[PDB]
Amino acid sequence: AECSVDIQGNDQMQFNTNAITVDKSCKQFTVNLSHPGNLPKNVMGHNWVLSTAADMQGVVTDGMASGLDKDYLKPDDSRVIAHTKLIGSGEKDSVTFDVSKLKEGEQYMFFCTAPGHSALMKGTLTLK
Amino acid sequence: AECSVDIQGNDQMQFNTNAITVDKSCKQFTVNLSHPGNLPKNVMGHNWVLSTAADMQGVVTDGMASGLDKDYLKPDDSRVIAHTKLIGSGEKDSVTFDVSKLKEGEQYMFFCTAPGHSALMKGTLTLK
Ligand SMILES: [Cu+2]
Ligand SMILES: [Cu+2]
């Protein structure tokens, strides 16, 4: 609906969509992170980070060397715009960020940071 | 088959099984690693590593820290009783090993070492 998305993350390492379209009719955009499945955090754990595709891998790498204890995300990451916290199945989590934080025509991509989940748990965030 | 498992590494981190048996009536065993799935090595690579349940941790670990140009295994890993290579989309590779390396009543474990894969990609080797 209006200024929020209902995004999923399953047991298959599948986000529900690779497409997030953020209208300019906004100042705040919310991400409704959900996880159907029956797998715990330490197994099929998901998250949601935002950043320039340029920096993506920076997040990923750093995220990786920071453990589950740091939500597979370096403490205070200047590349991380928005970001949720890791979540297991039947769990939930939201994040809000300022639409003004996203500069016109730049590469925006979303993705889980849990080791080797990056790959196919990715997306493009388009500022409409 | 006899001696013999063909295991399956698909795309959604699911090795076909969770248990492999190695009858005592063998000096040597042989494992068939297929790879159903359109996804490249670097993306969703698979292997087959064998060790006590005791070293697993150390092996998933050191492995991870070693890179796709080292099939996420640590050169000459003494903990590793036998391993295949890391296979891309549809690729194939086998391992053949001396069953006499195995001591009954020990907990043996098989698994992939690709970053956050052993989560789901692990199982049981039973010297029957
Ligand atoms: Cu994930
Ligand atoms: Cu694997």
PDB file of N, CA, C and O in Angstrom, chain A residues 20 31 48-61 73 77-84 95 97 101-103 105-113 118 121-126:
ATOM      1  N   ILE A  20      11.109  -3.042  -5.335  1.00  0.00           N
ATOM      2  CA  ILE A  20      10.700  -2.007  -4.421  1.00  0.00           C
ATOM      3  C   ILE A  20      10.899  -0.611  -5.121  1.00  0.00           C
ATOM      4  O   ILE A  20      11.976  -0.087  -5.410  1.00  0.00           O
ATOM      5  N   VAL A  31       9.427  -0.700   5.869  1.00  0.00           N
ATOM      6  CA  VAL A  31       9.666  -2.060   5.329  1.00  0.00           C
ATOM      7  C   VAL A  31       9.137  -3.077   6.334  1.00  0.00           C
ATOM      8  O   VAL A  31       9.773  -3.191   7.416  1.00  0.00           O
ATOM      9  N   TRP A  48      17.487  -7.171   6.181  1.00  0.00           N
ATOM     10  CA  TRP A  48      17.141  -6.232   5.097  1.00  0.00           C
ATOM     11  C   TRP A  48      17.982  -4.992   5.370  1.00  0.00           C
ATOM     12  O   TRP A  48      17.783  -4.387   6.391  1.00  0.00           O
ATOM     13  N   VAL A  49      18.894  -4.750   4.506  1.00  0.00           N
ATOM     14  CA  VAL A  49      19.830  -3.625   4.473  1.00  0.00           C
ATOM     15  C   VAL A  49      19.586  -2.857   3.187  1.00  0.00           C
ATOM     16  O   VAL A  49      18.873  -3.436   2.319  1.00  0.00           O
ATOM     17  N   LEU A  50      19.996  -1.628   3.103  1.00  0.00           N
ATOM     18  CA  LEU A  50      19.798  -0.760   1.952  1.00  0.00           C
ATOM     19  C   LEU A  50      21.120  -0.062   1.776  1.00  0.00           C
ATOM     20  O   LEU A  50      21.888  -0.033   2.743  1.00  0.00           O
ATOM     21  N   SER A  51      21.435   0.322   0.545  1.00  0.00           N
ATOM     22  CA  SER A  51      22.689   0.938   0.145  1.00  0.00           C
ATOM     23  C   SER A  51      22.839   0.926  -1.384  1.00  0.00           C
ATOM     24  O   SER A  51      22.121   0.269  -2.138  1.00  0.00           O
ATOM     25  N   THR A  52      23.865   1.684  -1.751  1.00  0.00           N
ATOM     26  CA  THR A  52      24.356   1.790  -3.134  1.00  0.00           C
ATOM     27  C   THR A  52      24.926   0.436  -3.555  1.00  0.00           C
ATOM     28  O   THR A  52      25.883  -0.105  -2.929  1.00  0.00           O
ATOM     29  N   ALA A  53      24.499  -0.100  -4.721  1.00  0.00           N
ATOM     30  CA  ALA A  53      25.016  -1.351  -5.245  1.00  0.00           C
ATOM     31  C   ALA A  53      26.540  -1.331  -5.277  1.00  0.00           C
ATOM     32  O   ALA A  53      27.144  -2.416  -5.356  1.00  0.00           O
ATOM     33  N   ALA A  54      27.106  -0.169  -5.304  1.00  0.00           N
ATOM     34  CA  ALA A  54      28.539   0.074  -5.330  1.00  0.00           C
ATOM     35  C   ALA A  54      29.130  -0.461  -4.020  1.00  0.00           C
ATOM     36  O   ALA A  54      30.081  -1.236  -4.106  1.00  0.00           O
ATOM     37  N   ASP A  55      28.469  -0.015  -2.945  1.00  0.00           N
ATOM     38  CA  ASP A  55      28.844  -0.374  -1.589  1.00  0.00           C
ATOM     39  C   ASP A  55      28.292  -1.727  -1.137  1.00  0.00           C
ATOM     40  O   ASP A  55      28.881  -2.204  -0.143  1.00  0.00           O
ATOM     41  N   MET A  56      27.268  -2.293  -1.720  1.00  0.00           N
ATOM     42  CA  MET A  56      26.652  -3.529  -1.319  1.00  0.00           C
ATOM     43  C   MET A  56      27.626  -4.528  -0.667  1.00  0.00           C
ATOM     44  O   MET A  56      27.469  -4.949   0.476  1.00  0.00           O
ATOM     45  N   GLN A  57      28.575  -4.961  -1.461  1.00  0.00           N
ATOM     46  CA  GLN A  57      29.568  -5.966  -1.089  1.00  0.00           C
ATOM     47  C   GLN A  57      30.324  -5.544   0.132  1.00  0.00           C
ATOM     48  O   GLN A  57      30.736  -6.423   0.922  1.00  0.00           O
ATOM     49  N   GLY A  58      30.455  -4.249   0.349  1.00  0.00           N
ATOM     50  CA  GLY A  58      31.138  -3.669   1.544  1.00  0.00           C
ATOM     51  C   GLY A  58      30.340  -4.118   2.774  1.00  0.00           C
ATOM     52  O   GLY A  58      30.915  -4.775   3.622  1.00  0.00           O
ATOM     53  N   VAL A  59      29.062  -3.796   2.807  1.00  0.00           N
ATOM     54  CA  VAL A  59      28.106  -4.229   3.798  1.00  0.00           C
ATOM     55  C   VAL A  59      28.339  -5.754   3.977  1.00  0.00           C
ATOM     56  O   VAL A  59      28.900  -6.170   4.972  1.00  0.00           O
ATOM     57  N   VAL A  60      27.955  -6.527   3.020  1.00  0.00           N
ATOM     58  CA  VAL A  60      28.048  -7.979   2.966  1.00  0.00           C
ATOM     59  C   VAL A  60      29.280  -8.493   3.650  1.00  0.00           C
ATOM     60  O   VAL A  60      29.133  -9.137   4.715  1.00  0.00           O
ATOM     61  N   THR A  61      30.448  -8.183   3.197  1.00  0.00           N
ATOM     62  CA  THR A  61      31.736  -8.609   3.771  1.00  0.00           C
ATOM     63  C   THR A  61      31.779  -8.281   5.258  1.00  0.00           C
ATOM     64  O   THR A  61      31.997  -9.162   6.109  1.00  0.00           O
ATOM     65  N   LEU A  73      25.986  -7.366  10.629  1.00  0.00           N
ATOM     66  CA  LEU A  73      26.076  -5.927  10.192  1.00  0.00           C
ATOM     67  C   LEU A  73      27.030  -5.155  11.100  1.00  0.00           C
ATOM     68  O   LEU A  73      26.791  -5.018  12.321  1.00  0.00           O
ATOM     69  N   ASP A  77      27.449   1.538  10.336  1.00  0.00           N
ATOM     70  CA  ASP A  77      27.802   1.424   8.932  1.00  0.00           C
ATOM     71  C   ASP A  77      27.238   2.562   8.102  1.00  0.00           C
ATOM     72  O   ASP A  77      26.063   2.564   7.682  1.00  0.00           O
ATOM     73  N   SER A  78      28.150   3.492   7.799  1.00  0.00           N
ATOM     74  CA  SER A  78      27.840   4.658   6.948  1.00  0.00           C
ATOM     75  C   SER A  78      27.314   4.341   5.562  1.00  0.00           C
ATOM     76  O   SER A  78      26.818   5.268   4.851  1.00  0.00           O
ATOM     77  N   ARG A  79      27.387   3.096   5.151  1.00  0.00           N
ATOM     78  CA  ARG A  79      26.834   2.637   3.854  1.00  0.00           C
ATOM     79  C   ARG A  79      25.376   2.239   4.071  1.00  0.00           C
ATOM     80  O   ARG A  79      24.524   2.352   3.193  1.00  0.00           O
ATOM     81  N   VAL A  80      25.090   1.817   5.298  1.00  0.00           N
ATOM     82  CA  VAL A  80      23.722   1.333   5.681  1.00  0.00           C
ATOM     83  C   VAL A  80      22.830   2.529   5.918  1.00  0.00           C
ATOM     84  O   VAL A  80      23.083   3.426   6.758  1.00  0.00           O
ATOM     85  N   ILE A  81      21.847   2.657   5.078  1.00  0.00           N
ATOM     86  CA  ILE A  81      20.847   3.756   5.006  1.00  0.00           C
ATOM     87  C   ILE A  81      19.771   3.399   5.987  1.00  0.00           C
ATOM     88  O   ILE A  81      19.687   3.982   7.080  1.00  0.00           O
ATOM     89  N   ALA A  82      18.965   2.430   5.657  1.00  0.00           N
ATOM     90  CA  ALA A  82      17.980   1.720   6.429  1.00  0.00           C
ATOM     91  C   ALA A  82      18.697   0.392   6.802  1.00  0.00           C
ATOM     92  O   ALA A  82      19.926   0.324   6.623  1.00  0.00           O
ATOM     93  N   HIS A  83      18.040  -0.568   7.360  1.00  0.00           N
ATOM     94  CA  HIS A  83      18.474  -1.841   7.872  1.00  0.00           C
ATOM     95  C   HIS A  83      17.467  -2.386   8.910  1.00  0.00           C
ATOM     96  O   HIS A  83      17.093  -1.595   9.827  1.00  0.00           O
ATOM     97  N   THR A  84      17.119  -3.654   8.845  1.00  0.00           N
ATOM     98  CA  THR A  84      16.274  -4.208   9.932  1.00  0.00           C
ATOM     99  C   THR A  84      17.333  -4.934  10.799  1.00  0.00           C
ATOM    100  O   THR A  84      18.540  -4.743  10.604  1.00  0.00           O
ATOM    101  N   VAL A  95      11.423  -1.303   9.694  1.00  0.00           N
ATOM    102  CA  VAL A  95      12.407  -0.226   9.631  1.00  0.00           C
ATOM    103  C   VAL A  95      11.752   0.853   8.767  1.00  0.00           C
ATOM    104  O   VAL A  95      10.915   0.571   7.910  1.00  0.00           O
ATOM    105  N   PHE A  97      12.846   4.857   7.282  1.00  0.00           N
ATOM    106  CA  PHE A  97      13.972   5.680   6.811  1.00  0.00           C
ATOM    107  C   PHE A  97      13.351   6.860   6.048  1.00  0.00           C
ATOM    108  O   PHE A  97      12.164   6.833   5.652  1.00  0.00           O
ATOM    109  N   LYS A 101      16.659  10.518   1.940  1.00  0.00           N
ATOM    110  CA  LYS A 101      18.016   9.987   2.138  1.00  0.00           C
ATOM    111  C   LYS A 101      18.543   9.293   0.882  1.00  0.00           C
ATOM    112  O   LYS A 101      19.727   8.924   0.829  1.00  0.00           O
ATOM    113  N   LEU A 102      17.658   9.128  -0.071  1.00  0.00           N
ATOM    114  CA  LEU A 102      17.775   8.532  -1.361  1.00  0.00           C
ATOM    115  C   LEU A 102      17.714   9.599  -2.500  1.00  0.00           C
ATOM    116  O   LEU A 102      16.670  10.085  -2.925  1.00  0.00           O
ATOM    117  N   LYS A 103      18.897   9.835  -2.996  1.00  0.00           N
ATOM    118  CA  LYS A 103      19.307  10.717  -4.094  1.00  0.00           C
ATOM    119  C   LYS A 103      18.942  10.177  -5.477  1.00  0.00           C
ATOM    120  O   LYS A 103      19.105   9.005  -5.869  1.00  0.00           O
ATOM    121  N   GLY A 105      18.166   8.961  -9.071  1.00  0.00           N
ATOM    122  CA  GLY A 105      18.946   8.090  -9.955  1.00  0.00           C
ATOM    123  C   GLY A 105      20.299   7.713  -9.344  1.00  0.00           C
ATOM    124  O   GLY A 105      21.363   8.266  -9.692  1.00  0.00           O
ATOM    125  N   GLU A 106      20.253   6.795  -8.391  1.00  0.00           N
ATOM    126  CA  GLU A 106      21.467   6.201  -7.826  1.00  0.00           C
ATOM    127  C   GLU A 106      21.145   4.724  -7.707  1.00  0.00           C
ATOM    128  O   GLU A 106      19.917   4.368  -7.914  1.00  0.00           O
ATOM    129  N   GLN A 107      22.131   3.881  -7.473  1.00  0.00           N
ATOM    130  CA  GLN A 107      21.793   2.426  -7.553  1.00  0.00           C
ATOM    131  C   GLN A 107      21.322   1.975  -6.217  1.00  0.00           C
ATOM    132  O   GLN A 107      22.157   1.915  -5.284  1.00  0.00           O
ATOM    133  N   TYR A 108      20.015   1.684  -6.114  1.00  0.00           N
ATOM    134  CA  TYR A 108      19.810   1.219  -4.690  1.00  0.00           C
ATOM    135  C   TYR A 108      19.509  -0.244  -4.519  1.00  0.00           C
ATOM    136  O   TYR A 108      18.640  -0.768  -5.179  1.00  0.00           O
ATOM    137  N   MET A 109      20.249  -0.892  -3.594  1.00  0.00           N
ATOM    138  CA  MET A 109      19.869  -2.327  -3.570  1.00  0.00           C
ATOM    139  C   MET A 109      19.671  -2.774  -2.100  1.00  0.00           C
ATOM    140  O   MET A 109      20.476  -2.445  -1.237  1.00  0.00           O
ATOM    141  N   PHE A 110      18.705  -3.668  -1.951  1.00  0.00           N
ATOM    142  CA  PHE A 110      18.340  -4.373  -0.722  1.00  0.00           C
ATOM    143  C   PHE A 110      18.803  -5.844  -0.768  1.00  0.00           C
ATOM    144  O   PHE A 110      18.997  -6.415  -1.811  1.00  0.00           O
ATOM    145  N   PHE A 111      18.954  -6.444   0.415  1.00  0.00           N
ATOM    146  CA  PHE A 111      19.571  -7.734   0.660  1.00  0.00           C
ATOM    147  C   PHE A 111      19.800  -8.271   2.063  1.00  0.00           C
ATOM    148  O   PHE A 111      20.311  -7.538   2.921  1.00  0.00           O
ATOM    149  N   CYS A 112      19.614  -9.555   2.246  1.00  0.00           N
ATOM    150  CA  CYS A 112      20.003 -10.171   3.520  1.00  0.00           C
ATOM    151  C   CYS A 112      21.524 -10.212   3.647  1.00  0.00           C
ATOM    152  O   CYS A 112      22.238 -10.174   2.636  1.00  0.00           O
ATOM    153  N   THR A 113      22.106 -10.145   4.839  1.00  0.00           N
ATOM    154  CA  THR A 113      23.524 -10.122   5.113  1.00  0.00           C
ATOM    155  C   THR A 113      24.065 -11.413   5.717  1.00  0.00           C
ATOM    156  O   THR A 113      25.296 -11.470   5.970  1.00  0.00           O
ATOM    157  N   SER A 118      23.182 -13.374   0.560  1.00  0.00           N
ATOM    158  CA  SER A 118      23.451 -12.314  -0.330  1.00  0.00           C
ATOM    159  C   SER A 118      23.063 -12.782  -1.740  1.00  0.00           C
ATOM    160  O   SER A 118      21.915 -12.530  -2.150  1.00  0.00           O
ATOM    161  N   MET A 121      19.308 -13.147  -2.517  1.00  0.00           N
ATOM    162  CA  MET A 121      18.483 -12.334  -1.587  1.00  0.00           C
ATOM    163  C   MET A 121      19.060 -10.911  -1.777  1.00  0.00           C
ATOM    164  O   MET A 121      19.968 -10.420  -1.115  1.00  0.00           O
ATOM    165  N   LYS A 122      18.564 -10.371  -2.881  1.00  0.00           N
ATOM    166  CA  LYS A 122      18.940  -9.082  -3.412  1.00  0.00           C
ATOM    167  C   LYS A 122      17.772  -8.459  -4.133  1.00  0.00           C
ATOM    168  O   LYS A 122      16.723  -9.119  -4.324  1.00  0.00           O
ATOM    169  N   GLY A 123      17.915  -7.158  -4.398  1.00  0.00           N
ATOM    170  CA  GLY A 123      16.831  -6.384  -5.035  1.00  0.00           C
ATOM    171  C   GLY A 123      17.294  -4.989  -5.439  1.00  0.00           C
ATOM    172  O   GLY A 123      18.373  -4.565  -5.066  1.00  0.00           O
ATOM    173  N   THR A 124      16.452  -4.338  -6.216  1.00  0.00           N
ATOM    174  CA  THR A 124      16.629  -2.985  -6.684  1.00  0.00           C
ATOM    175  C   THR A 124      15.455  -2.126  -6.136  1.00  0.00           C
ATOM    176  O   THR A 124      14.284  -2.481  -6.294  1.00  0.00           O
ATOM    177  N   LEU A 125      15.867  -1.049  -5.522  1.00  0.00           N
ATOM    178  CA  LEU A 125      15.088  -0.038  -4.910  1.00  0.00           C
ATOM    179  C   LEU A 125      15.133   1.182  -5.870  1.00  0.00           C
ATOM    180  O   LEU A 125      16.205   1.765  -6.037  1.00  0.00           O
ATOM    181  N   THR A 126      13.954   1.412  -6.403  1.00  0.00           N
ATOM    182  CA  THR A 126      13.781   2.498  -7.396  1.00  0.00           C
ATOM    183  C   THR A 126      12.989   3.667  -6.825  1.00  0.00           C
ATOM    184  O   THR A 126      11.829   3.496  -6.400  1.00  0.00           O
TER     185      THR A 126
END
